[PDB]
């Protein structure tokens, strides 16, 4: 039955992909072989070329992503050959090292074997490969609240965090046929971190804030021509506001604005003073200053929006419809200072693409 | 035919209105009379009570409005009796005076005769009763670009602006049966203006910015039970960001951020400095400081959002569905610091309500 669903998604994708590749003539034949492989096996296998291009198309079609200008330069690592948990661990470790590139971050995706019958071969439990643990007990709040449930899941499995506010969570993933996942502590030599300082307020270091260099989202599914790559972690570099305006700012995350207000020497007593706003701007200047100073890639929300404008222009020139989610494309500080705020975007879902999937903890 | 449309909108509205008024028993009879009046005349007439409540419901159902907590205290002035252009002028003048209230702004709406057959009795050309003129010729840009087309329309009709950046546009409106509108210069004694100063940067006054105290939107149609009040200007007080983050900030409006950056003594050379953001925050602090200091009502975006949260809670307690437009409800600075950013809103249109209508110039 579902060989139907597979076949159509496959037809649609190969047509578009080979088209974009200048390989339109080779379609009729490639579709032939696929049509057979699906009938005989129930599935089909992407060539390295198809997979590379599909991953890139997927990034292109991500409505919520402001960084899409650079879709065609995505570094694609094809790890469909892994069979063991040591191989998976080692692939994840390598992804971190190669994407980090001593600070000159390379947008990279590592692609693991896809689901078979809907049966996962590898299931990654991390939300990002590098993420801080979070604890809550007895009114005591430590670390990143967003991580509380995964952190408790790890500590069931024999891991124990030091309970600093910046414990690195271990890599944790499950292999097909194992009832439980395995976890591996991150080698600290692989993980770049950036201490947050302010370009001119020396007291800012008193907050003793830091963040990791590279966000590597490891819990979304990549879908390409009806093939489901549930384990396919990817990364770009950070936009400063993600760190300065959310991770460090949100009440349900690190909730640092009162503390920022104090070190920058303004009162946090009256709404009409806009002290949250002033705090947000200084925290965000500090984050950009710190990353740049350490030689770790980052982009500010203005430059990002200028880049996205070129992505829009480039879509038009190529004859491709542009899709977008305005509510995620606008930055969370000074959104109306970007062109994004002042236009609308069609939020249709086009495949290939990256999707949410159910967490296996919680 | 359309006596149908009128009758249903009328049924729906009277039911809800009398319900909310504790007057449910009086519905069957009120609907009777309306049912007759529609058959015999093609239309019906709202009692003062119905009109007052409908205007209030309309404000309640305005998805894009963050200030809805205070819907039930709207001051409703019923001017369905006007017949002459001197009466219309004088009603508009009075609205300005009573809503301004020496700075202690009263949310007010003045309601003029409704459309008859779709035939307007009074057509107001102003977008707000108090608005600045705008000019563009020979690379020369003066005043508010948003006003360029109405400003050129007035100058056709024999008005002439002084071409400062803050010329007050005249009131301009057309009466049924006149081919052309009339215009009347605003008496400067009626219009409060606020010079923009900064609480601690004395140089800020060098920008010589100002804005008017009371935004009185005069080009939307109020619709209540199938009756179309195309001329029904209303006002609240300003949220600071409307002035500081848009009117004065937008590139297509007064475009003051570079000038703000200079007077606050920061460079405007690098995106990574977030100088636009820092400028926005200081301009916005200045606007709140200036209004408060002059004793003219204004609300900051945090307090506003706290109020809107209570509106949400109050809707729930009353059994009413909440509708909202997230893309207009979030403020344009520090939106993620408000609860609004972190939830979703249903954007359905519920009547009574305020609607856009076609401009008669341009
Ligand atoms: C190169 C630098 C990149 C930047 C600066 C960037 C920027 C962003 C930002 C700011 C968001 C919003 C995330 C949030 O607010 O939680 C986002 C979402 C997203 N980005 Fe990118 N991105 C980049 C690269 C990538 C890459 C390489 C991919 C995949 C190949 C990707 C796919 C996505 C997806 C799928 C989302 C939405 C996830 C969701 O719905 O939660 N981006 N991006
Ligand atoms: C009492 C103080 C009030 C505040 C602070 C307030 C705040 C706001 C703000 C900030 C907007 C967004 C406007 C924009 O960004 O251009 C807005 C939209 C709106 N408000 Fe309110 N408002 C208030 C009173 C009122 C009143 C009295 C009414 C009508 C009775 C009203 C009806 C609306 C409508 C219809 C819109 C949307 C107009 C459109 O679609 O362009 N508001 N309000
Ligand atoms: C704040 N949103 C959290 C909910 C959620 C759940 C799963 C994935 C997810 O991704 C956000 C996301 C995804 C990809 C990114 C790529 C680069 C980048 N700088 N940020 C990125 C941010 C976000
Ligand atoms: C920036 N939007 C301009 C487009 C447009 C066209 C016609 C009306 C309009 O209203 C915005 C609006 C409406 C009512 C308001 C009431 C109070 C207030 N403080 N702002 C308010 C702002 C807005
Ligand atoms: C709908 C579309 O996103 C459009 O850019 C909206 C965004 N929100 C807005 N908000 C305000 N206050 N004023 C506007 O003109 C717009 N435009
Ligand atoms: C869709 C709904 O508006 C929701 O609050 C969205 C808004 N935009 C967001 N933007 C980011 N970056 N992260 C989020 O979690 C959300 N949540
Ligand atoms: Cl993150
Ligand atoms: Cl305005």
From Swiss-Prot, chains A, B:
Binding residue positions for heme: 65
Any one GO BP annotation for this protein: nitric oxide biosynthetic process
Catalysis performed (reactions): 3 reduced [flavodoxin] + 2 L-arginine + 4 O2 = 3 oxidized [flavodoxin] + 2 L-citrulline + 2 nitric oxide + 4 H2O + 5 H(+)
InterPro entries in the record: Nitric_oxide_synthase_Oase-su (IPR017142), NOS (IPR050607), NOS_dom_1 (IPR044943), NOS_dom_2 (IPR044940), NOS_dom_3 (IPR044944), NOS_N (IPR004030), NOS_N_sf (IPR036119)
Keywords: Heme, Iron, Metal-binding, Oxidoreductase
Cofactor(s) required, per the database record: heme; (6R)-L-erythro-5,6,7,8-tetrahydrobiopterin
Record has Isomerase as a keyword: no
One Pfam entry name: NO_synthase
EC number: 1.14.14.47
EC category: oxidoreductase
GO molecular function, one term: metal ion binding
Top-level taxon of origin: Bacteria
Textual note on the cofactor: Tetrahydrobiopterin (H4B). Can also use tetrahydrofolate (THF) in place of tetrahydrobiopterin (H4B) but binds THF with much lower affinity than H4B.
CDD domains found in the cross-reference section: NOS_oxygenase_prok
Record-annotated disulphide pairs: none
SUPFAM superfamilies assigned: Nitric oxide (NO) synthase oxygenase domain
Keyword Transcription regulation among record annotations: no
UniProt function note: Catalyzes the production of nitric oxide.
Quaternary data: Homodimer.
Protein family (similarity comment): Belongs to the NOS family. Bacterial NOS oxygenase subfamily.
Note: This protein is similar to the oxygenase domain of eukaryotic nitric oxide synthases but lacks the reductase domain which, in eukaryotes, is responsible for transfer of electrons to the ferric heme during nitric oxide synthesis.
Record's protein name: Nitric oxide synthase oxygenase
Lineage, broadest ranks: Bacteria, Bacillati, Bacillota, Bacilli, Bacillales
């Amino acid at each position: 039955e579902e060989k139907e669903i597979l076949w159509n998604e496959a037809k649609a994708f190969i047509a578009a992909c080979y088209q974009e590749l200048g390989k339109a003539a080779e379609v009729k034949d490639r579709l032939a072989d696929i049509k057979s492989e699906i009938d005989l096996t129930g599935s089909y296998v992407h060539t390295k070329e198809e997979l590379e291009h599909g991953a890139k198309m997927a990034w292109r079609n991500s409505n919520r992503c402001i960084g899409r200008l650079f879709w065609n330069s995505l570094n694609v690592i094809d790890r469909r050959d892994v069979r063991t948990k040591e191989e998976v661990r080692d692939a994840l470790f390598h992804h971190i090292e190669t994407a980090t590139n001593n600070g000159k971050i390379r947008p990279t995706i590592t692609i693991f074997p896809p689901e078979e019958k809907g049966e996962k071969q590898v299931e990654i439990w991390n939300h990002q490969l590098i993420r801080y643990a979070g604890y809550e007990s007895d009114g005591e709040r430590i670390g990143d609240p967003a991580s509380c449930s995964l952190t408790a899941a790890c500590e069931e499995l024999g891991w124990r965090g030091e309970r600093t506010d910046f414990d690195l969570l271990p890599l944790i993933f499950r292999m097909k046929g194992d009832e439980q996942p395995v976890w591996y502590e991150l080698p600290r030599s692989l993980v770049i971190e950036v201490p947050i300082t302010h370009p001119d307020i020396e007291a800012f270091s008193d907050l003793e804030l830091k963040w990791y260099g590279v966000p590597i989202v490891s819990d979304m599914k990549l879908e390409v021509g009806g093939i489901h790559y549930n384990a396919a972690p990817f990364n770009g570099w950070y936009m400063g506001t993600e760190i300065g305006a959310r991770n460090l700012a949100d009440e349900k995350r690190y909730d640092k604005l009162k503390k920022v207000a104090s070190v920058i020497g303004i009162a946090a007593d009256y709404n009409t003073d806009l002290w949250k706003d002033q705090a947000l701007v200084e925290l965000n200047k500090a984050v950009l200053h710190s990353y740049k100073k350490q030689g770790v890639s980052i982009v500010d929300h203005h430059t990002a929006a200028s880049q996205f404008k070129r992505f829009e222009e480039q879509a038009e020139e190529a004859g491709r419809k542009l899709t977008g989610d305005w509510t995620w494309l606008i930055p969370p500080i000074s959104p109306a200072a970007t062109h994004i705020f002042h236009r609308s975007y069609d939020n249709s879902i086009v495949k290939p693409n990256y999707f949410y999937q159910d967490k296996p903890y919680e």
